[PDB]
């Protein structure tokens, strides 16, 4: 059995996470199991770096007016 955090998101973000898995942008292959077109299984010990990467992607194409 596998222990971790299930991630539910839009298909676009699922494809982005799948790309991050193979691109080794985090240093390892921690995106292990893909179960659904909108759900993936991720190890829980580094859920913060995925949050940082997603936030960077989100505010990269945002142009904050500040």
């Amino acid at each position: 059995v596998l222990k971790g955090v299930l991630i539910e998101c839009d298909p676009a973000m699922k494809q982005f996470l799948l790309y991050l898995d193979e691109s080794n942008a985090l240093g390892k292959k921690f995106i292990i199991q893909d179960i659904d077109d909108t759900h993936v299984f991720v190890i829980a010990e580094l859920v913060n770096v995925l949050q940082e990467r997603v936030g960077e992607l989100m505010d990269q194409n945002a142009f904050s007016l500040t």
Partner: protein, 434 residues
């Protein structure tokens, strides 16, 4: 929670005792829905119960849902009660105590709500309505500052304990001041009448710890709600517990009183509004506030970026980063929109949408950015040899209520870590019995 939700959760004895005061009956009647008020007024002068079918025939067929809701709310509030009419019929008649007190409040009878005001003559140190409003504003600002923790505002220890019991501020270590929680931020984002009502409801819930009568406190609060602004009332005629409650209200700013021994007390606009515009919002994501107190400036800065601070004006810009930070602090987008709409300048009230749709939609979308990724810790099972074996285990997991996600096509399922041991034990036992 509104008044009706709290009233419906009380025992029938408390509700019956509440209706003995005319002030409570008027507040309950005004809290009723539009359809319920007409039914109460029609049955006000009835000494005989009416058939349920006859009452049900008053409203049209399409609006039967509202009729059912009003009847259910009236039954829950125990305004009327079911009567076994002879012949197997069921009759509905208003509560005699509630009906009598409502008629007394409306038509007249008995003694006045307050004892008297001319016994002591004119007040030597009477104030004015603007002065009372300023006093109420100062008291409320002091309370909200004490919520933050500034040393300039020093209040009673029991007032701090009340916030501690309300969960807004937690005292992890004795001696040090308590720290405000996220619920404190959400409460601050609420409007002043709602804040007062929530505080009073918490006081009512926790009054049993102080050994105070709920019925008397509610009756006095309702009497204060209908009090005339700028008019004094007699302290005399109240129990010692009522005196302590009045002192607490004076500490809260609802009631003005020069001295504890004084026999006069002046209800304020907060007390009148207890039972129940300076922000300009522009399409360029800018806020213009016509306020001077630090409280409003801080509240607006909770979810916006400040740009200029004029003596009578504040120029702020609502940006994505500020809204995201406010949401990370615990404030939801709906609360932000409600705060903006309630504080909206009278000029903005002219437009059919008080708040421009673009700003509200953008704030809501900014709220949705944070929760894009949904996280649910669990254990994944993917070693199913047969579909039939998977179905039984999935049904057992659904019976246990520990299922997180299911995939029948690929025979994949996710269960909560707490239920993982139970699922493992169930799966092992099935193989052993085979």
């Amino acid at each position: 929670r509104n008044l009706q939700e709290f009233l419906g959760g009380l025992s029938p004895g408390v509700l019956d005792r509440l209706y003995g005061h005319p002030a409570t009956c008027l507040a309950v009647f005004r809290e009723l829905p539009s359809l319920a008020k007409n039914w109460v007024m029609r049955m006000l002068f009835l000494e005989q119960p009416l058939p349920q079918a006859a009452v049900a025939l008053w409203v049209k067929k399409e609006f039967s849902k509202a009729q059912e809701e009003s009847t259910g709310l009236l039954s829950g509030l125990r305004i009327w009660h079911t009567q076994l009419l002879p012949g197997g019929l069921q009759g509905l008649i208003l509560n005699p105590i509630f009906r009598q007190n409502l008629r007394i409040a409306l038509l007249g009878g008995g003694k006045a709500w307050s004892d008297d005001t001319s016994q002591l003559g004119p007040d030597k140190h009477a104030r004015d309505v603007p002065s009372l409003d300023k006093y109420a504003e100062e008291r409320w600002e002091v309370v909200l500052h004490f919520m933050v923790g500034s040393p300039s505002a020093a209040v009673s220890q029991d007032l701090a304990q009340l916030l501690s019991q309300a969960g807004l501020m937690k005292s992890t270590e004795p001696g040090e001041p308590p720290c405000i929680t996220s619920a404190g931020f959400q409460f601050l984002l609420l409007d002043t009448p709602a804040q007062l009502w929530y505080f009073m409801l918490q006081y009512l819930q926790t009054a049993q710890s102080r050994g105070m009568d709920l019925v008397e406190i509610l009756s006095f609060l309702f009497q204060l709600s209908f009090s005339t602004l700028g008019k004094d009332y007699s302290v005399e005629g109240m129990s010692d517990s009522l005196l302590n409650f009045l002192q607490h209200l004076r500490e809260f700013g609802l009631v003005f009183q020069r001295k504890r021994k004084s026999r006069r007390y002046y209800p304020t606009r907060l007390a009148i509004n207890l039972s129940s515009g300076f922000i300009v919002v522009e399409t360029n994501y800018r806020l213009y506030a016509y306020t001077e107190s630090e409280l409003q400036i801080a509240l607006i800065a909770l979810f916006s970026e400040m740009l200029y601070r004029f003596p009578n004006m504040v120029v702020a810009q609502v940006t994505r980063e500020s809204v995201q930070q406010a949401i990370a602090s615990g404030i939801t987008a709906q609360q932000i929109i409600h705060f903006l709409r309630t504080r909206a300048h009278p000029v903005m009230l002219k437009q059919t949408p008080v708040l421009p749709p673009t700003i509200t939609d953008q704030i809501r979308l900014w709220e949705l950015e944070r929760d894009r990724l949904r996280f649910t810790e669990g254990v994944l099972y993917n070693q199913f040899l047969s579909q039939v074996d998977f179905e039984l285990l999935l049904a057992h997991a659904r019976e246990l209520g520990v299922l997180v996600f299911e995939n029948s096509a690929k025979r994949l399922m996710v269960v909560t870590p707490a239920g993982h041991s139970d699922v493992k034990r169930f799966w092992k036992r099935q193989k052993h019995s085979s």
